[PDB]
RNA sequence: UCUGAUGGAGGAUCGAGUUGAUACUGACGUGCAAAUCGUUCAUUUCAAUCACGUUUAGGGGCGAAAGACUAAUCGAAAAG
RNA sequence: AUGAACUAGCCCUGAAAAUGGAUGGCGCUAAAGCGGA
RNA sequence: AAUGUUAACUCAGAACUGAAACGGACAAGGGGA
RNA sequence: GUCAUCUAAUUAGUGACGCGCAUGAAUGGAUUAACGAGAUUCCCACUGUCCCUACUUGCUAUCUAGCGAAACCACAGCCA
RNA sequence: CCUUCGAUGUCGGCUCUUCCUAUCAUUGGGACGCAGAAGUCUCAAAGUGUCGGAUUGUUCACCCGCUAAUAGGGAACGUGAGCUGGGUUUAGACCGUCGUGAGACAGGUUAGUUUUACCCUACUGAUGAAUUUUAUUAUAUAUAUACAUAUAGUAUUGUGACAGUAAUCCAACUUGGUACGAGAGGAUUAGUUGGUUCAGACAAUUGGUACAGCAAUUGGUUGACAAACCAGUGUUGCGAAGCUAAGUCUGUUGGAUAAUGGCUGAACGCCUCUUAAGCCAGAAACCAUGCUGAUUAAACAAUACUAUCU
RNA sequence: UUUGCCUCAGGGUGCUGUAAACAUGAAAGUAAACUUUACGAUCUGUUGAGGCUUAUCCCUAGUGGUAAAGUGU
């Protein structure tokens, strides 16, 4: 189970709402820390493509909502330098709530996904649809 | 050589170079330039702009 | 009181005096140390940048997610005319560090070089050198010797080119270069074997090697503190100026500290940038000179219409890896390293695939100018 | 008792100007200025605004009251 | 001629604070230190 | 009742039209609990 | 202050509770639509406020020609 | 209550630097109620780091969360001609208690001007002459010579004393479900690939930027068309180049040590790391290497040419 | 500082997006003649046109230019 990630561009720091991308119930997302970020004066937490988060359900299932909950970022929209040298970027910013340990909480995926994040989470490549 | 097509113009894009915007569904489109990505994001239509390849075809300009 | 907050300083204190450098021409501090065991080969070459390329390049590295994957990188090339050398310099170590014994000249010394010699050649009888060049060979032979007997380390004055350049300047570019190799005769020998004729950089450098690369900064002139140091803007509110530092220092050493960022000089700043790899060196002599196995298409380096702000690439090349210090046209000094490097990174053989060609001046759609006519038609 | 017109009430509404002076605690602060400048702001048919004339004078005046103002002078003017 | 116990000289530990650093400084150890004459 | 000479400016509706834009500058409430 | 609620977290806000250091009835008490350049909190929109700065425009600064003050000033002007 | 009342701007935050160690983490160790893992005590260590938020004017505090760790401090309780001005500490006003009252409150609440650098220094960059009681690590054909060399001016190339200094930490995976363990669990160490923070550049690429430029277009104006203009940059669209980060690249290895463990080995017929002499290995420390400056050395060398030189 | 350089021009490279002009071309329609003649956003053809492209792009022995004549040792 590798966490090898390439670096992606940084783009959706803390406070960031994002589209909740799962079958779980929840709307959006309210993403409160990035784990693995360490320390830098006044810099505000970022994450990107791979990365867990922390986030709260500002709208869904009342069963979500009031609690502090881990997520995948599986889309995102600040464009960020593929290896092959094109610039990919979604639409929109949307990631999949999950465990500590990375099992989905939902079952299905709703739109594409980025294959930055299939390779770093093979439980979420089984419920992908288009991934790209 | 692996040259890519640029969706919006039928453009050649050599390696390195554009920017690949895949939208609501799971549709890639792949832009050669920014301009071309700003058109695209305009919602302009391709077949509407006198210069490319597009309208060109469209009007039998070959 | 302790600041509140702790955070890392600023700029770096180990490049402080960021003044201008003296000399457009990096001077190379330090060689090499001498291993005497291998032959006596140069280890540093003049070049001058010329603009950058992106590449595409097979990957190697196993365990990378980036594995068996082409890869897109940047690249400078540094346009490399064969430097010439025209002396030997004989340095001797003292207590008091280097000190030289003498300098053997060539023969002929080119008109370029003269140049050098002097800040208004169009107005001199350019006289330089008219009488060291006749000199008597004896005389010479003389110094060699007591280089060979006394002297430890060898230098040789080679200098640039620039006529074979798009540069302006007809001057030459001087520059000591030391010899690292075995006996201090065989050093001389080989110089002797050299001294009047042209090294080209292969006979310097090869592909896959990792080399440092030392060149003076691009300029800025009088930079604010933001842009020189990276200091955080003051809010909005502030009144004198948001641009600055807020407080310079204590009350208590009484006396602004050298630690403290300041509004000055940016850029223009000699610079070591090391571990550069060369991913191709170009010759003159080679009309497929950015085309590749998998390219197979005639292609010079020249992007078409030509590196901006440099010019048309018509002779032999450097392609770096990455970035190097300096704007187009600037001259730069590539040096071998100075510990002999065993890193994967060093080792590692790179073939590339692609050589970007296409314009610079825009975002080009294609490499030559003949896929462009081609793509057109006949037109008006 | 509803519906549509009419009608044109109101210390009604918004708002140029005018009268002010909320914020930027912006500019300025050896100023253009012993209170200005900018943008923003409040005021506009009434307890409205302005002019001129006129009344009220110092332990006095005048005050929708801030000890405000009473010629850059005010918890007692200025002049001698 | 070893084993104890004490004893007091010098020395060591105990002995950690913020500008750089002060037997006044350099330095000094067959003292240029400490105690004498 | 039909036929004349003739006037503002306002409303309402429909085609086509454009790189979907239109109180195109100017001017002009942020709103809610 | 305790209990809710707002928040991932709230010395804030709101709703309750009340033997209230020292609430309370024209010292007016309790409540109130409308109104407010009033005080306070939250939410949506929005944004360079921020991450995280960058680029850019005038007018200054800058250099020149001309003109040309002042405050300040025991003497002056490196540190441990 | 020594200083300051012919004024040292009186809290906190923001910014920014430096220092301390009474070490939270990281490096190297020693101990254990150390099987492993985790942790506790402790030695050399201040090289590197020590964050994002919610409430509070706060310091302090308290939670949320990341983190390797979220150690503690100082520098006129660092830092107001740096800001801010929320608080405290003017004048307005309200409440509560106290006072007959004017008023008081180290009780609560709201509204409330933050001046000047053009001086010296310091620091940052920027030129720049001068330098013979001064210099010199040698020059000259095995001998000589400091009882000696050295004119000066341009320029090139060097020397490099001295000063500055830079990289940091983590994760995942393989080593390994191994060592260890009744089992649960479960490493060190290297190795690989990545990332964080920082630094230094750079602009191929993506993005940003527009008063190069092209096109559109509103209102007006030139009889119309065209060509233009005006609206302090009229407003949009694209926008090269140049700048630029949120984009790309790069960031060493010796010496000698500290703690410590040892070696030989007395004192003390044995033992003893030395608490003698003599040695060894050994740290993110130190000093070099490398890197920046070097009118920091009033420094100097060589070379090139010259105007008179001996 | 005359095998340079500036200067225009051409060519390259791009940027923009198809110039003016004419078309018994097309056009939602309208009116007014005895099938033609007016008006008509806009579109199409000639038209990847026209314009711009170094002021800090590139090339070209393509054009015309290259003065001052002073100071210091
Ligand atoms: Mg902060
Ligand atoms: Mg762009
Ligand atoms: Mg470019
Ligand atoms: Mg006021
Ligand atoms: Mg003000
Ligand atoms: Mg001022
Ligand atoms: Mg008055
Ligand atoms: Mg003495
Ligand atoms: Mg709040
Ligand atoms: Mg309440
Ligand atoms: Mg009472
Ligand atoms: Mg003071
Ligand atoms: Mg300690
Ligand atoms: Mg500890
Ligand atoms: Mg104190
Ligand atoms: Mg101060
Ligand atoms: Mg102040
Ligand atoms: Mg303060
Ligand atoms: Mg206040
Ligand atoms: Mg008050
Ligand atoms: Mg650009
Ligand atoms: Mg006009
Ligand atoms: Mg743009
Ligand atoms: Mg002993
Ligand atoms: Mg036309
Ligand atoms: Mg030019």
Redesign the pocket.
């Known amino acids: 189970?590798?966490?090898?990630?390439?670096?992606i561009?940084?783009?959706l720091?803390?406070g960031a709402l994002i589209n909740c991308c799962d079958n779980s119930g929840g709307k959006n997302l309210?993403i409160?820390?990035?784990?693995?970020?360490?320390?830098?004066?006044?810099?505000?937490?970022?994450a990107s493509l791979g990365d867990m988060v922390?986030a709260?359900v500002?709208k869904g299932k009342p069963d979500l909502?009031?609690?502090?909950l881990n997520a995948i970022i599986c889309r995102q929209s600040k464009?960020w330098?593929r290896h092959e040298?094109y610039?990919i970027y979604f639409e929109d910013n949307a990631g999949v709530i999950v465990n500590p340990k990375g099992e989905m909480k939902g079952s299905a995926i709703t739109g594409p996904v980025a294959r930055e994040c299939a390779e770093l989470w093979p439980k979420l490549s089984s419920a992908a649809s288009a991934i790209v | 050589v692996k040259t890519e097509a640029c969706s919006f113009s039928e453009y050649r894009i050599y390696p390195?170079?554009?920017?690949k915007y895949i939208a609501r569904d799971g549709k890639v489109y792949f832009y050669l330039?920014?301009?071309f990505?700003?058109?695209a994001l305009?919602?302009?239509?391709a077949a509407?702009?006198?210069?490319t390849?597009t309208w060109?075809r469209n009007?039998k300009?070959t | 009181?302790?600041?509140?907050?702790?955070?890392?300083?600023?700029?770096?204190?180990?490049?402080?005096?960021?003044?201008?450098?003296?000399?457009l021409?990096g001077?190379?501090?330090?060689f090499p140390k001498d291993d005497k065991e291998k032959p006596p080969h140069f280890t540093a070459f003049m070049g001058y940048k010329a603009?950058?390329?992106?590449i595409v390049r097979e990957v190697d590295?196993?365990?990378?997610?980036?594995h068996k994957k082409e890869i897109?990188?940047?690249c400078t090339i540094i346009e490399c005319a064969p430097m010439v050398v025209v002396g030997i310099?004989g340095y001797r170590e003292?207590?008091?560090?280097?000190?030289?014994?003498?300098?053997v000249?060539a023969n002929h010394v080119s008109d370029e070089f003269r140049r050098?010699?002097?800040?208004?050649?169009?107005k001199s009888e350019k006289?330089?050198?008219?009488?060291?060049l006749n000199v008597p060979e004896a005389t010479k032979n003389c110094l060699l010797k007591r280089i060979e007997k006394y002297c430890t380390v060898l230098r040789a004055?080679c200098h640039t080119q620039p006529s074979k350049t798009?540069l302006?300047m007809?001057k030459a570019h001087?520059?000591?270069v030391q010899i690292n190799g075995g006996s201090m005769k065989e050093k001389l020998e080989f110089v002797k074997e050299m001294l009047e004729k042209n090294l080209p950089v292969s006979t310097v450098f090869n592909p896959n090697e990792m080399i440092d690369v030392?060149s003076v900064?691009?300029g800025?002139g009088?930079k604010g503190v933001?842009?020189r140091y990276?200091?955080?803007?003051?809010?909005?509110?502030?009144?004198?100026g948001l641009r600055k530092?807020?407080?310079?220092?204590?009350?208590?050493?009484?006396?602004?500290?050298?630690?403290?960022?300041?509004?000055?000089?940016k850029?223009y700043?000699?610079?070591?940038?090391?571990?550069?790899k060369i991913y191709r060196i170009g010759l003159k002599t080679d009309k497929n000179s950015a085309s590749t196995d998998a390219d197979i298409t005639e292609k010079k380096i020249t992007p078409?219409?030509?590196?901006?702000?440099?010019?048309?690439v018509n002779e032999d090349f450097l392609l770096l890896?990455?970035?190097?210090?300096?704007?187009?046209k600037r001259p730069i000094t590539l040096r071998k390293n100075?510990?002999p490097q065993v890193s994967?990174d060093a080792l590692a053989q790179v073939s590339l695939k692609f050589i970007?060609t296409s314009?610079?001046?825009?975002?080009?759609?294609?490499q030559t100018?003949e896929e462009?006519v081609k793509?057109?038609?006949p037109?008006?």
């Open positions: 189970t590798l966490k090898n990630k390439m670096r561009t940084l783009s720091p803390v309210y409160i820390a990035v784990q693995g970020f360490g320390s830098c004066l006044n810099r505000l937490p970022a922390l709260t500002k909502r009031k609690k502090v464009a330098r040298g610039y | 390195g170079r554009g920017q330039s920014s301009k990505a700003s058109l305009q919602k302009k239509k509407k702009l006198r210069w390849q060109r009007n300009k | 009181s302790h600041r509140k907050f702790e955070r890392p300083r600023h700029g770096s204190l180990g490049f402080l005096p960021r003044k201008r450098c003296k000399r021409r001077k190379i501090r330090s603009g950058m390329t992106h590295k196993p365990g990378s997610k980036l897109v990188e940047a310099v003292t207590p008091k560090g280097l000190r030289i014994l003498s300098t000249w050098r010699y002097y800040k208004n050649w169009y006289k330089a050198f008219t009488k060291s004055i798009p302006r007809k001087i520059m000591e030392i900064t691009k800025h009088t933001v842009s990276g200091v955080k803007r003051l809010p909005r509110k502030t009144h004198r530092v807020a407080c310079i220092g204590a009350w208590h050493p009484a006396r602004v500290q050298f630690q403290i960022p300041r509004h000055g000089q850029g700043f000699h610079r070591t940038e090391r571990n550069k078409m219409g030509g590196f901006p702000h440099y010019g048309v890896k990455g970035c190097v210090a300096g704007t187009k100075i510990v994967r970007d314009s610079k001046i825009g975002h080009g759609r294609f100018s462009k793509y057109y038609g037109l008006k």
